[PDB]
Amino acid sequence: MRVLIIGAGILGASAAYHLARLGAQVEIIDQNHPGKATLAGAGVVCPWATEADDPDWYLLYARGARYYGTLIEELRGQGETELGYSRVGALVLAEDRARLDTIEGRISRRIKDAPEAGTVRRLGAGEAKRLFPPLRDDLEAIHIPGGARVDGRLLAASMLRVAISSGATLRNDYVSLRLNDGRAECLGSDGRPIPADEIIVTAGAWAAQILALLGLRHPVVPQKGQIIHLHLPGVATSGWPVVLPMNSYYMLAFDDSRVVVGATREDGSGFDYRVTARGQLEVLQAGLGIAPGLADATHIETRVGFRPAGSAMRPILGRVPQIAGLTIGNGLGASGLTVGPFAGHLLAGVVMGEPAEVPLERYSPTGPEA
Amino acid sequence: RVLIIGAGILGASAAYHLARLGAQVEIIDQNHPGKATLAGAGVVCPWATEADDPDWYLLYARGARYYGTLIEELRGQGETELGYSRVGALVLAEDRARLDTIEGRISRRIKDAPEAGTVRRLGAGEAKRLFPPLRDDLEAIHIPGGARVDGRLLAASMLRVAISSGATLRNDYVSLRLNDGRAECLGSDGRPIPADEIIVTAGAWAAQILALLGLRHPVVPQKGQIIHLHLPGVATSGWPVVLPMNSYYMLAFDDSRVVVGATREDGSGFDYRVTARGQLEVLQAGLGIAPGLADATHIETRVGFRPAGSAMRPILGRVPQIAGLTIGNGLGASGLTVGPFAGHLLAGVVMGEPAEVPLERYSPTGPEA
Amino acid sequence: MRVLIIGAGILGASAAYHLARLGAQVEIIDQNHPGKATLAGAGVVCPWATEADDPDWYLLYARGARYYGTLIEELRGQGETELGYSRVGALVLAEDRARLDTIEGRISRRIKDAPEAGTVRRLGAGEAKRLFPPLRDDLEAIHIPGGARVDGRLLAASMLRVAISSGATLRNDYVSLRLNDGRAECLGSDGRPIPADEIIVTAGAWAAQILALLGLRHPVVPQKGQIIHLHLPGVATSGWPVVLPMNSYYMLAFDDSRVVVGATREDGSGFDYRVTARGQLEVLQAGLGIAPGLADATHIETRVGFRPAGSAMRPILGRVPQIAGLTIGNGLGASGLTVGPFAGHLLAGVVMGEPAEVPLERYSPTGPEA
Amino acid sequence: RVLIIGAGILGASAAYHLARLGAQVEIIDQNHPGKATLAGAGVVCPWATEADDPDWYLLYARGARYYGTLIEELRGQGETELGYSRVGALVLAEDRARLDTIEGRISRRIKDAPEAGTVRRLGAGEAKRLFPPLRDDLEAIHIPGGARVDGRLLAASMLRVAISSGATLRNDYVSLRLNDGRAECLGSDGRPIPADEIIVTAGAWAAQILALLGLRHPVVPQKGQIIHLHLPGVATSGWPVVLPMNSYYMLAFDDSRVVVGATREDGSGFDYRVTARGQLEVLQAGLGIAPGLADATHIETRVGFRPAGSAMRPILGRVPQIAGLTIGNGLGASGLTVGPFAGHLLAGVVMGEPAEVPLERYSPTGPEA
Numbered sequence A, C: 001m002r003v004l005i006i007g008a009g010i011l012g013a014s015a016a017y018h019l020a021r022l023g024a025q026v027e028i029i030d031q032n033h034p035g036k037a038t039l040a041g042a043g044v045v046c047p048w049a050t051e052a053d054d055p056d057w058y059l060l061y062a063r064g065a066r067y068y069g070t071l072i073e074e075l076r077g078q079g080e081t082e083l084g085y086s087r088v089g090a091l092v093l094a095e096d097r098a099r100l101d102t103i104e105g106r107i108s109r110r111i112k113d114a115p116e117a118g119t120v121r122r123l124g125a126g127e128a129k130r131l132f133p134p135l136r137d138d139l140e141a142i143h144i145p146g147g148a149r150v151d152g153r154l155l156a157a158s159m160l161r162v163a164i165s166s167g168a169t170l171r172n173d174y175v176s177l178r179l180n181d182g183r184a185e186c187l188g189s190d191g192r193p194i195p196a197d198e199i200i201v202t203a204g205a206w207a208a209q210i211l212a213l214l215g216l217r218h219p220v221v222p223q224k225g226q227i228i229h230l231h232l233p234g235v236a237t238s239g240w241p242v243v244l245p246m247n248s249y250y251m252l253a254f255d256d257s258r259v260v261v262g263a264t265r266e267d268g269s270g271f272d273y274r275v276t277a278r279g280q281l282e283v284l285q286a287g288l289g290i291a292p293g294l295a296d297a298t299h300i301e302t303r304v305g306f307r308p309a310g311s312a313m314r315p316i317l318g319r320v321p322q323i324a325g326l327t328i329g330n331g332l333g334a335s336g337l338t339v340g341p342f343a344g345h346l347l348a349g350v351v352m353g354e355p356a357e358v359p360l361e362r363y364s365p366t367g368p369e370a
Numbered sequence B, D: 001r002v003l004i005i006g007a008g009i010l011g012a013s014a015a016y017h018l019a020r021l022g023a024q025v026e027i028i029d030q031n032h033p034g035k036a037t038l039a040g041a042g043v044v045c046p047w048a049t050e051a052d053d054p055d056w057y058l059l060y061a062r063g064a065r066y067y068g069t070l071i072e073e074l075r076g077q078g079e080t081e082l083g084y085s086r087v088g089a090l091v092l093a094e095d096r097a098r099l100d101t102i103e104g105r106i107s108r109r110i111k112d113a114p115e116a117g118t119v120r121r122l123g124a125g126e127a128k129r130l131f132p133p134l135r136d137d138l139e140a141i142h143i144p145g146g147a148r149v150d151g152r153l154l155a156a157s158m159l160r161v162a163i164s165s166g167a168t169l170r171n172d173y174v175s176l177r178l179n180d181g182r183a184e185c186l187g188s189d190g191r192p193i194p195a196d197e198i199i200v201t202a203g204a205w206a207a208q209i210l211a212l213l214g215l216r217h218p219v220v221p222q223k224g225q226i227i228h229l230h231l232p233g234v235a236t237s238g239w240p241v242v243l244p245m246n247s248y249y250m251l252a253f254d255d256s257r258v259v260v261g262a263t264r265e266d267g268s269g270f271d272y273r274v275t276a277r278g279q280l281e282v283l284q285a286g287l288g289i290a291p292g293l294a295d296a297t298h299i300e301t302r303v304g305f306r307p308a309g310s311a312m313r314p315i316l317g318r319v320p321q322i323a324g325l326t327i328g329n330g331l332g333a334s335g336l337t338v339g340p341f342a343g344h345l346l347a348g349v350v351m352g353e354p355a356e357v358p359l360e361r362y363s364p365t366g367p368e369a
Ligand SMILES: Cc1cc2nc3c(=O)[nH]c(=O)nc-3n(C[C@H](O)[C@H](O)[C@H](O)COP(=O)(O)OP(=O)(O)OC[C@H]3O[C@@H](n4cnc5c(N)ncnc54)[C@H](O)[C@@H]3O)c2cc1C
Pocket: A006, A007, A008, A009, A010, A011, A012, A029, A030, A031, A032, A033, A035, A036, A037, A038, A039, A040, A041, A042, A043, A044, A045, A152, A173, A174, A175, A176, A202, A203, A204, A205, A206, A207, A210, A224, A225, A226, A227, A263, A264, A304, A305, A306, A307, A308, A329, A330, A331, A332, A333, A334, A335, A336, A337, A338, A339, A340
């Protein structure tokens, strides 16, 4: 009766994974809405290049990317060997040499507190193409040996599998909320309450819909994103790194001759689960523009997902003011696969009472407006 | 003016009927996974049902006859593709003993229903002559007048007519609170949604927001999986509905397509998944009476959550002790037949007309303590 | 113009994989017809329990199962580490103890000269359910620790990747054949011949269509097969064994909470690439019959594949009599994922002239029928 | 009597005409991946075509106005679902200059072709009023006679009429053999297929089986990728066809569906794959002139291999020096407009009727020593 988690994406799954290790009874409930963000998550893990230069770097991006090393092994030693993860390195690009210099600097300043990045290095024209053949030969780049990739769906799935293997439960259902005597109550499909000492709301983009039932104003709305998957027949891509043109687009490669190209950021889209023409056109232009070698690659599918985009680019983590037994994790935006796993460790310490490894006040949620 | 929460077959009909009368209708629909109206098979044949509840049957048979008014009212408005057709129905039974008791039930309920046509008990092989895939050793009772419809296309057409008449439709999950004895609607952001009259046709999900008002809404979801088949290059526009009276059924549509009866999974919750045993049961039932479907293409299997109430009879009418709030739900497994006519009844409530049928026996319950 | 391979299934891919490593210039052509057998192969590798006792066929079946040990590491050391292979053991079931005793006899006789099978051990009721939870608790079984499984598509894909990394070429095209001056010619899309010293036809079920152009009578026709893929949300299956109920059906599990169930065997089906109703019913009955735990598992997809089923259960491998520069490999039927990989190694030696590890006279095709 | 190899729009048209003349028809089709007729967009508008070749345009114009006869003969036969509609056509251009030259070329060719109607030059967004997604700043030339059709449904309709008239259809990959000067057809089993006359409408794959007779058939596949869009809740049955005169195009069907011009990939072979650049080219060309399609749903991308010949002129007529063999191929990118009438000619060849059109300029070559 310890913990009840609403939503089992990368964030809700990481919370369960970390809670099950603390001996708590974890009950997970996940509807798996069409457009579940984690099912469409590209899988880039490389914070050192992010242009968002706030103290969130020291707290979430840096700390989160440093934990991937430990997490992958902790999972590997538990029977979970299919995560799609690989420390393949990353290539960062820019249109003009001027902007490419300020980015190299921003990365250099951020290697001190994250040695997993390796030895950052400046590549000349044609050298990035030797690591990612589809790239243009006239592209200079910055190589970050530490940058990795992952299959967002498989990572969350494996974390859930480890939790359920050790006394956790998972079912497919849609639950709601009610405010009882100042405490948070979870109402099942029938309508009866679901006994739980602590509740965690990691409902992603849909969180604002059930939290509003408690008088809360959750400032997280869906940001639609369309992401293209390509197939290179008979092409060994297991060693290819990730590519970050620093223009809201990106692309990476997986072992099964597969290449994924950066997604769109459609604001005010709502929950529009449709593959549109312009959306795919945007991605195809940005992709083939830097990597003409992908021209004759097969188009296998185009996934759609709704990012939990918060008002601020920083997430919303911590216990709810004025409401007992309610914690929420959301707002991961476009960096959820990188921050999600560690953010889940934070929520684990919150509901249990462990000492805060970081100051969550910068991310604490808002209370009832009344 | 009017705010409708939930745009299934029921919420859509209410908007359709109200918009035509000039009321400012604002529709908000979340489109939950498993929206019942999207998964509805579309059989309309109440005279054979084995459930004997007059309060419920009164609307079942009445809503069936209403299709005569609806199809034409929609036809004369640009809407001609609703999948509706008066193709007739075949009622089957395994042992001739049960078939006799059923032939009795049908005649007893046809007393006030000439729309059912002239019933006739068919000899072995006569049912297969109208539905070839059936096995030849099946006696049946033919009800010329039983029809089918594409519930998905019916709700879509009624919404289009409502929007063309000044209604609005947007996607959101809204809630309710008690302000001054009246029902006030809050959007996801939390801002209020001004409305003189609110209607709640949220299907199985209705018991999640009404509970915020102290109401005990006895409607929970009953999952149901339904299989769609395709006979490549086979004319099916004339095939009848088939009701083996064993919780299963099957019907046909124009596009060489055959739909097979659904499951009934109590205590499923909103488990939007296509399970194995669910499809095994449907395929065993279908292929058991219709072995001709063996080599038919399986194109998709849909899932839906029926708004199953504590009692089989629905819940319609204003909420006692709460002003400006009306509820419609509980349709269960007959919402496509009862839905359209019920929306007409919900419209009359918020508009104030005298009830074409006394709604007292369907009214909801007030706030509890 | 060293070698031209027609068809890139598991067999054509294995041949290419072996030839390219020996310096031969390999040109691979594969249309990827709908129903490609390799893309729908279940992936069971456990020959010792087979009811079919054909020495000509069994020689390659048990031989091709042992070759998997070499292949997995060979591919592993080349960057191909995600092949879905695992030595998870197998469970052999039967309804009545009478036939289960007969099966135990066949296995023992064939497990004595096969240490790869491990220590065969007869389990009591409920012990097979301890390894495959969804099974019935009343089932006796025979445990073969050596039984393994693999993802057929990922295996053939990785082989091609290693082959093309070794100077081979892969193209999507439909080619034909004509007989010119007693030697085999391959007609490209334009209709003009394609220069090639040696041709290998691994066209699977479609092989007879183009080989008939040379006066041959290739007795390999398609046998449709429908196979169901299930999903157990939040269930660790990496350690689940294979199940062989010895009733033409079967089922296995993969790492990502996925369970596959035995396939149909539709003779005279032609190239009917449809998912039928009865085909799925039969599989569901067999699966849930012995494994009620799969009842509430998700059904994610149902694949279709045309097995290259030959008149004789033994395959067809070797040069074509009276026709120079032609080599045929086909007839793998329902055991190609086990035989395919090693059978490709045989085809490689044939076309190059190396001595045959196994006398191939018993598998040679027939010559032109004047 | 007659044996047809390949059941695309060309082989189907041939079967539809032969069955009416009382010939015993046996049709065999392998339905290769990328069958051109299954991916054909279906624009019918020869008057605007830029390719001014009289040897090829003789049939293009002649075959286009044959659609009038064909639709009615099919409409008066139970076949009413052809996707055909005389919706008109809009011809656009980059600059007013090129648009002027096109208007002149169009009017010259309608003298003895009144099916085009009254051509009118639009300007300043008048074209957008008939095709909303277009840009407002586009002048155009309206050709009321331009129509569209679903090549997939048309070929099926002809076949059904042919089968209702004693024709047979089978699935197999057949070959050809020289048996004492006669053309003989061998099935997959190797046994011969008795046929008094053989017609080869094998499309791009023809060169492969004809090489078996020592013939050199200069028809190779030209891959083309085509995109289908869906406009949620938008009536498009009345929208005309659009011909930007830039190697691309787009048309609209009844079911809120819009199709965009195809790619032209030479030397592609039978590469049955949907590529990235191919879709980028079509999306750019489509949205470049029709920004309104930005938020349209992408439902499908089809691939087909055009029977592109060395010369744009097709290949029709008996094979020299080989007895009982006839060839039809080379339809290229205009097969849906020329195909139907071309099948009528192939029927006239094998039966012996006089040539309505000069066959000398299309006949194939004989064996090369
Ligand atoms: C196209 C795309 C590409 C991306 N690429 C990257 C990348 O390269 N790197 C990176 O770091 N991040 C990336 N992201 C961001 C990342 O995928 C997300 O930020 C993150 O996965 C969000 O996970 P979540 O669990 O918070 O949300 P979700 O994954 O949406 O989880 C919410 C879950 O809760 C369920 N739920 C909701 N309401 C209820 C309810 N009432 N009852 C029950 N269940 C409920 C939903 O059905 C869902 O399963 C990408 C995102 C997109 C869309």
